Amino acid sequence: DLASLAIYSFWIFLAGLIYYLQTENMREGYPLENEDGTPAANQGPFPLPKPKTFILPHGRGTLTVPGPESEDRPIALARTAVSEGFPHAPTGDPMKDGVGPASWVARRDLPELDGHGHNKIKPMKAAAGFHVSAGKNPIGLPVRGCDLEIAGKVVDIWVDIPEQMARFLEVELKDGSTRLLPMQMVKVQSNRVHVNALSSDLFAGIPTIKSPTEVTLLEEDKICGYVAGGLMYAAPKRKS
Amino acid sequence: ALLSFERKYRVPGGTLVGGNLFDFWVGPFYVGFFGVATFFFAALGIILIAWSAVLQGTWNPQLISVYPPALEYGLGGAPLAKGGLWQIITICATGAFVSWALREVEICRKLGIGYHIPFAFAFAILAYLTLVLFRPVMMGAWGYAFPYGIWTHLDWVSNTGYTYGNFHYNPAHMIAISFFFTNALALALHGALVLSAANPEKGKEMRTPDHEDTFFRDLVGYSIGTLGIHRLGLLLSLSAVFFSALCMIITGTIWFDQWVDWWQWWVKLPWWANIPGGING
Amino acid sequence: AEYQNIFSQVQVRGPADLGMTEDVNLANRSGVGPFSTLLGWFGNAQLGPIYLGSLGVLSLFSGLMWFFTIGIWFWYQAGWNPAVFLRDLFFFSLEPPAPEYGLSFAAPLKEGGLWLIASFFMFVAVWSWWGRTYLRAQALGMGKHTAWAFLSAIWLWMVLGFIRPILMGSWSEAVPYGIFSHLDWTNNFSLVHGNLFYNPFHGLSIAFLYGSALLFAMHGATILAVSRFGGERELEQIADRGTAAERAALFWRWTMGFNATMEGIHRWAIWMAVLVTLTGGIGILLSGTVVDNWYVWGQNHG
Ligand code: BCL
Ligand code: BCL
Ligand code: BCL
Ligand SMILES: CC[C@H]1c2cc3[nH]c4c(c3C)C(=O)[C@H](C(=O)OC)c4c3nc(cc4[nH]c(cc(n2)[C@@H]1C)c(C(C)=O)c4C)[C@@H](C)[C@@H]3CCC(=O)OC/C=C(\C)CCC[C@H](C)CCC[C@H](C)CCCC(C)C
Ligand SMILES: CC[C@H]1c2cc3[nH]c4c(c3C)C(=O)[C@H](C(=O)OC)c4c3nc(cc4[nH]c(cc(n2)[C@@H]1C)c(C(C)=O)c4C)[C@@H](C)[C@@H]3CCC(=O)OC/C=C(\C)CCC[C@H](C)CCC[C@H](C)CCCC(C)C
Ligand SMILES: COC(C)(C)C/C=C/C(C)=C/C=C/C(C)=C/C=C/C(C)=C/C=C\C=C(C)\C=C\C=C(/C)CC/C=C(\C)CCC=C(C)C
Ligand SMILES: COC1=C(OC)C(=O)C(C/C=C(/C)CCC=C(C)C)=C(C)C1=O
Ligand SMILES: CCCCCCCCCCCC[N+](C)(C)[O-]
Ligand SMILES: CCCCCCCCCCCC[N+](C)(C)[O-]
Ligand SMILES: CCCCCCCCCCCC[N+](C)(C)[O-]
Ligand SMILES: CCCCCCCCCCCC[N+](C)(C)[O-]
Ligand SMILES: CCCCCCCCCCCC[N+](C)(C)[O-]
Ligand SMILES: [Fe+3]
To answer: Which residues lie on this side of the membrane: Periplasmic (chain B)?
Structure first.
């Protein structure tokens, strides 16, 4: 009957839909690779979809995916075993080398832009007339690391203009230079900003930005990766 | 076996138990101590279900059903073929689910990400435990729990609901449902909004989050924003499940009559209880 | 205790955001509403502007008329007594015509006529609102995913109040306007059709409904978990994959053996959600038209 036909048809449709969805989700990261970067023998039963192209605004070009995949950066790790499936040990300082949970991606070394082609993220001092509108204003507070030592002081908030949100704290260090700290990685308290991810001696090593009034997607990735990496890699200097 | 960008994240560390002993992968899957635990619990559970099937005398997936001890057993043990298998399978399930969550925690630690995912999953586990553990304990028997069978679990839902009349009248159930419906609504809108921006009219440049805010302000006069929507989806789905667990934990314990009659407290308020007219006068 | 990004610690505000222009008729946008600091702990603090336009006025007028038609009937049932109105609020019901009137518009006001009027207003309110989801996306140059998704919800709604009653040959088959009564209608529908648990399209609708909560919990949690790398800036992560999108994909690959992309998760999302009402509407539409009793149908599998 018609109900039998509807249900049978539905399941055929659903298999087709899942096939479509899975292949759509293979537009990044495939083909699969061996641990040495060569194509893996087993790519699985889903083939790559035909390429699609995104037109990017403001003259930034296009993105076509799937496309040739490459890390576009050195990866300072080495095998710890003679066969596949084991961890890869940092060959240097993993925080400095940007691997493991300190990883960054070689994103475009330009700032994200808003719908009007202006820098999406700006220091609040340069954003007319953005201001703190609620909660404890962190500007001026000392910044404490997981070693319970003061690493610096907050000198600004970097704000997302179109979305009206705090994105980073700008922190001045002992030498007068500043670093950006992801808002999601700080705790604003009454008398301080607390950073559990980093001990005070690691603040100097936070990746710096090239221009003092903008931050590129590449620089954001290196900053955020480094700070998050401290959770694992500063665990020795933390501290109940 | 690796995504193109995957190797740089496959470093040692993040384990909760065992140090480096189980710090490895099998194909895409991370293992860890809790991967081993999940495998053990799941394996035992599945073997015991297969044994329950043999004792039931069927291999049909639509027929296999593992029932909890009858009510006469109260909260005691029961012979294997008479509820004991359900009891052991339930310990296995619980072990497998909790192990799965803890393995998710180890994966978060290795990846340097927040713990939101296993935290969220723990709500599902707590709802499962409400039905198989907390509620039966409060009611005084394992037999109030649901059986493990594709259709028999549905018989349990129907029988349990109609024990209290139309279960629609459970007010915690009304809230739970509102969160489920609102969640699906928000999921549809989130999926649609992102895709409508990423895949604009033919030949046009990708839209921005400014356009997403704009679209929604144009439409309803408000946009929650890109952070807000992910906060929202999380809150709606966890609230739905929290009120689900709540709606069941109070049923058969603090409220055990017909849920429809609960609503009389409002109608019977002294100020209007006795005014004629309307539906209830 | 670490910060979890469920509520903001510090709110910032700048000039009211008037939005993107593109092809929008700006004459039809309101001014900005107030700013809610309360809302701003969780989402955006800004309210408005909203787009008006003549279609917008039509939907709102029609929607209010639907609401007021039901509300006037309720006051009447309450004998115009405010105390009885509040007492019995959830008990009042505006009911469709009796089966004897079939599909005619010939039923008296108090006996179905008013239901048809309310339903007429609802029909124009929803469809003109659907027009608006399409037109607002168009004016911005955006894809039509919202209108397509909304159409799936509309499908179940149309099946329940319009298509199924027409196919059954009477308005009596439609849903009443009432809090408790719509629930009684729902319970009755299942009882009368041999238990909807036996309707495979109902079981599917449930799989998608539960699956929507599973998936939004997964996606919402994932994005918050990688918000420390800017994960919620999903459009730019689609255009230019960052460590947020990579860590998110790998969490899931390591957990369950496969993963999504920043764009593709939104496709799993939209389909998981829309399939709720797509399968649902099919299950209801078949009920009583093709299948009188789902338990009986299921015994024959067909
Ligand atoms: C005739 C029946 C009654 C009914 C009686 C009941 C009863 C009885 C119950 C509900 C409950 C539910 N009802 Mg009711 N209710 C009915 C009418 C409805 C209607 C409707 C439109 O009419 C709706 C929308 C709902 C909706 C609701 C939900 C609020 C809730 C189910 C979700 C849930 O608990 O998730 C919570 C999610 C879980 C329990 C899943 C947990 C799973 C996890 C931990 C792991 C499992 C994975 C594992 C096995 C993996 C497999 C391996 C593979 C590799 C994948 N009911 C009618 C009136 N309702 C239930 C509830 O609230 O339960 C708490 C409940 O017990
Ligand atoms: C939640 C409140 C009620 C309940 C109410 C109902 C109702 C009502 C219905 C279901 C339906 C389903 N329920 Mg139930 N169900 C309950 C608790 C469970 C539990 C559990 C707590 O362990 C599980 C695993 C299931 C699983 C099932 C699936 C067979 C089916 C689709 C669900 C789904 O897609 O979810 C969403 C999640 C996903 C989309 C992820 C995929 C997970 C599924 C497909 C895993 C299947 C597991 C199953 C085969 C168990 C095998 C375990 C193995 C031995 C390892 N239910 C409790 C008792 N459930 C529907 C059905 O059609 O049943 C016949 C249905 O109409
Ligand atoms: C005793 C009750 C029966 C029952 C009988 C029914 C009936 C009858 C139906 C369902 C339906 C559903 N049931 Mg059932 N169901 C039962 C048991 C359950 C259980 C359970 C036991 O745990 C569960 C989880 C469910 C779950 C579900 C859902 C999957 C599904 C509804 C999807 C939806 O999003 O609709 C909600 C979404 C809509 C209704 C779409 C709304 C559309 C738009 C256009 C709204 C416009 C509104 C606007 C004008 C008002 C604006 C106000 C604003 C403030 C502005 N049922 C038992 C067996 N169930 C529906 C279905 O599809 O079944 C197949 C259905 O018709
Ligand atoms: C709290 C919000 C929603 C939610 C969230 C949620 N679920 C989660 C997670 C999150 C955040 C994941 O991280 C985790 C996941 O990895 O997803 C892919 C998961 C998950 N939710 C899942 C299922 C699921 N979630 C459901 C519901 C929900 N999950 C809520 C609605 C349901 C419903 C609604 O019925 C189901 C069926 C899995 C896909 C996955 C957990 C997988 C897992 O725990 O693996 C370890 C265990 C095994 C591999 C098998 C164990 C076998 C047992 C020992 C024996 C079987 C006993 C069982 C009780 C029998 C059931 C028979 C049925 C017919 C009743
Ligand atoms: C695909 C499955 C899910 C889904 C999807 C969905 N719903 C949709 C859409 C989509 C994608 C939207 O695009 C559309 C929307 O605009 O969302 C914001 C919508 C929508 N789904 C809605 C409701 C809804 N959806 C439902 C659920 C679902 N929708 C499914 C779970 C339900 C349930 C579960 O029963 C409800 C009740 C609306 C919020 C919106 C459709 C709005 C609409 O059609 O409006 C018509 C009526 C009016 C214009 C106003 C009516 C008046 C009111 C009765 C009260 C008065 C308030 C008024 C607004 C105040 C104004 C006063 C002024 C004078 C100042
Ligand atoms: C205090 O008093 C004031 C003034 C504020 C007024 C108060 C208002 C009140 C109390 C109103 C309450 C409203 C309520 C309780 C509404 C509840 C509605 C519910 C629960 C609806 C649920 C189901 C609705 C469905 C499925 C309706 C579907 C309808 C259609 C698909 C429309 C079909 C169109 C028809 C039949 C008309 C045919 C016309 C043509 C030819 C197109
Ligand atoms: C890309 O990010 C998104 C936001 O930010 C730009 C949102 O604003 C919203 C829209 C927010 C609302 C009001 C959800 C509607 C649900 C209800 C409760 C009616 C969505 C969907 C979204 O995807
Ligand atoms: C919920 C529908 C079922 C989803 C499970 C099927 C999708 C997994 C397939 C992905 C395989 C991963 N692979 C081999 C391509 O890398
Ligand atoms: C305790 C429940 C028994 C688990 C059986 C394994 C799940 C199989 C899913 C049902 C498959 C239905 N099918 C394809 C045979 O028609
Ligand atoms: C579903 C969310 C409802 C959004 C609330 C509507 C807010 C619109 C306010 C804009 C009107 C501003 N005003 C009063 C100056 O015209
Ligand atoms: C509906 C449940 C089906 C369970 C299958 C889940 C899909 C997992 C696909 C990943 C397979 C991993 N791998 C590479 C070993 O094939
Ligand atoms: C957006 C596609 C999501 C794919 C998830 C598929 C879930 C199907 C549920 C399988 C169980 C079917 N059942 C038993 C509910 O009838
Ligand atoms: Fe998202």
So the answer is: 56-82, 139-170, 251-281
